[PDB]
Amino acid sequence: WGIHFVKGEVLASTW
Amino acid sequence: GLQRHHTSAEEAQKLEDGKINPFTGREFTPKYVDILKIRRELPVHAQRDEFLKLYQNNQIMVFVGETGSGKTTQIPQFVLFDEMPHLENTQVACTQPRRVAAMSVAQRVAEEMDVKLGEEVGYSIRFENKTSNKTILKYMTDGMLLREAMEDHDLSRYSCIILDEAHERTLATDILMGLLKQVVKRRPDLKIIIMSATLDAEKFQRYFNDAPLLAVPGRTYPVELYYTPEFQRDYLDSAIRTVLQIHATEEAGDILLFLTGEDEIEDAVRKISLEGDQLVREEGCGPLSVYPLYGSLPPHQQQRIFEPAPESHNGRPGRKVVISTNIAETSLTIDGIVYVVDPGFSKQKVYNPRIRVESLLVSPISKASAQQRAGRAGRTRPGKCFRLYTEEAFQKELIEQSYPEILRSNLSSTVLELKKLGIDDLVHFDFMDPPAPETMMRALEELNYLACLDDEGNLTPLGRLASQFPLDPMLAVMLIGSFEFQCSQEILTIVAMLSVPNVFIRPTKDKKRADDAKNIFAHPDGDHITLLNVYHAFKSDEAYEYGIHKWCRDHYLNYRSLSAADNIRSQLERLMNRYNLELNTTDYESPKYFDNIRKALASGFFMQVAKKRSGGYITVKDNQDVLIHPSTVLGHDAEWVIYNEFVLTSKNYIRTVTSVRPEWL
Ligand SMILES: Nc1ncnc2c1ncn2[C@@H]1O[C@H](COP(=O)(O)OP(=O)(O)O)[C@@H](O)[C@H]1O
Ligand SMILES: [Mg+2]
């Protein structure tokens, strides 16, 4: 471990 | 009964389930039945009927679908069932840009049709021709098909030609499209199929005279995105830590890691395996297998990436990690990927117009590549994509789209290769993304001046021989002609050194020290013999005893460039031996050694000669006012000088200069 992440945008479904 | 080019989806489906294999007449194995059940669920099978309706009333069609739709492994089978090639002694050729993809897909298709590989379905790569006289379907690299077209212009042996991964826009693919658009006119029975992974392909339709388009509906789940809150200095360690975190905390699901090259991939494999073993020892987590994937893998190692993830033994899910390199992007799909790690750097080819050298440099990917990498994350369940850079970097640092390889490579070698295929009207040739007419005209003029193309524009034996080598035709012609001056080995060394990026590093600070280091090698006659001296001192046993890396670092030399130069020199020696070209050398102690080297060097660079102004220098070609670069080793006035590179600043400069007597020109 040692890395922290920040949430981003979401890719919508292509259906 | 069975009609050529008039079958239907229902008839083909019914014939598939028959107890007798139509292509060979043997018995079907239960493995084939199970594989058919598994593969009948792909999106393409739903549209099979529409594809059949399109493939019969048209000659060229565009089939675009998202990666994983089953295009490379299915559409060829549909064509085979609609064509029945074995009744007309014709094959079907599918062109894959990447060798690994070609081999893996060929093996998969051999398994699917229940026929031994090499008999019915085979592959054709350079130095690996796994096929026989019974072959009916062939997966071949686009370069190999281009070579076959060079040997056989009309492609009389092929009935259908499928261009896969047309969105990559490689050089061979572009030339193949340009050639087929014209070949179709001669042959009424040839049928093309352009297959792309981008759901928007209007320009492909416009290029191919409004060819019909068929789209496979999207079948990709939503994928969340993650970024880091700050810039990452070392991205390999960050990638290792991210993979370990994903394995430790996230749910069940395989991981895909993108990296740059072979050495990085192997180091990452070792590090991740060691860290996973330590993690299992200390925290008792589940097993984590590791599989590499790069261009040079043997097939028995390529097939490993598809193996199932190991079963859990510690009460937590087991996982499989694939350390790929721009091959898992769109060439081949691995089932079971839910998490994707995207360092953001990939190895790309760049071209230097001033020096005329092609190099593979690690540079950031475009936005389309990052989007495709993220999309790989979700195909079975809602997945996650972890990006090792800031969102601001993604929205501002990356470029919108990459350029086609035709605009990113030497335009003279391309012309010399096109002339081999039999093309005549090069200026009027219809390229996908034509280069500016100025550069094409300049390339044609230069080729004519070198005697590669005679006054009539046709190829000549010297032109072909130069084309065989991996060099700018100027250097290739000089290499071929050097044998007459009894200094062939020296010219070989100099060409190898000149066909790579600069071997000198000249930072603003410590500039005087770098100048002294260069002058250690410098010979007071020109900057070309300096490269020969540097190479000779690079392979000397004294340097090896001292330590190659330390010696290169201390003397302000680029070790990577010199290693590339040695590789190119060895390749050139092998190729020269292949064609039986005379090689010789003059004794070092002879007084005419440097006279011979300069005589042979002036006969090659005659296109770039500058004269000392009365008064700094005036070029013979284009009459440009230039000044010798400060980083030079010229000793005397050097009334006549030969320059290799042109540096454009507020004051024009010429770099890598050397003197020459007028009589030699
Ligand atoms: N060697 C293999 N072993 C097992 N499954 C494979 C193999 N090769 C391909 N597949 C499966 O078949 C499908 C291939 O689709 P593909 O022909 O790559 O379509 P596209 O090229 O348009 O993505 C994938 O979904 C993959 O799961
Ligand atoms: Mg494919």
Numbering used by the authors:
A (entry chain B): 122 to 136
B (entry chain A): 52 to 666, 669 to 718
Mind quoting what the paper says about this structure?
Prp43 (human DHX15) is an archetypical multitasking DEAH/RHA-box RNA helicase which functions during pre-mRNA splicing, spliceosome complex disassembly, ribosome biogenesis, cap-proximal mRNA methylation, and host defence during viral infections. In addition, G-patch cofactors boost Prp43-ATPase activity locally to drive processive RNA unwinding/annealing events. Functional studies indicate the requirement of the G-patch cofactor Pxr1 (PINX1 in humans) for early nucleolar pre-rRNA processing steps and a separate role in Rrp6-dependent 3′-end processing of small nucleolar RNAs (snoRNAs). In addition to the activating G-patch, we discover an inhibitory segment within Tma23 and Pxr1, I-patch, that restrains Prp43 ATPase activity.
No density for most of the N-terminus of Pxr1 (residues 1-121), which encompasses the G-patch (residues 29-72), was observed, supporting the idea that this region is highly flexible and only transiently interacts with Prp43 to stimulate its ATPase activity. Despite incubating the Prp43:Pxr1GM complex with the non-hydrolysable ATPγS before vitrification, the resulting density map showed only ADP bound to Prp43. We found that the I-patch is anchored onto the RecA2 domain through a set of hydrophobic contacts and extends towards the RecA1 domain. F126, within the -FKVGE- sequence (green lines), clusters with hydrophobic residues F437 and L439 within Prp43 on the RecA2 domain. Another cluster at the C-terminal end of the I-patch involves the indole ring of W136 and the side chains of R270 and Y272 of Prp43, present within the loop that connects RecA1 with the RecA2 domain. In this conformation, the C-terminal Ratchet and the OB fold domains are rotated with respect to the RecA-like domains resulting in the repositioning of the OB fold domain by ∼24 Å as compared to the G-patch-bound closed conformation.
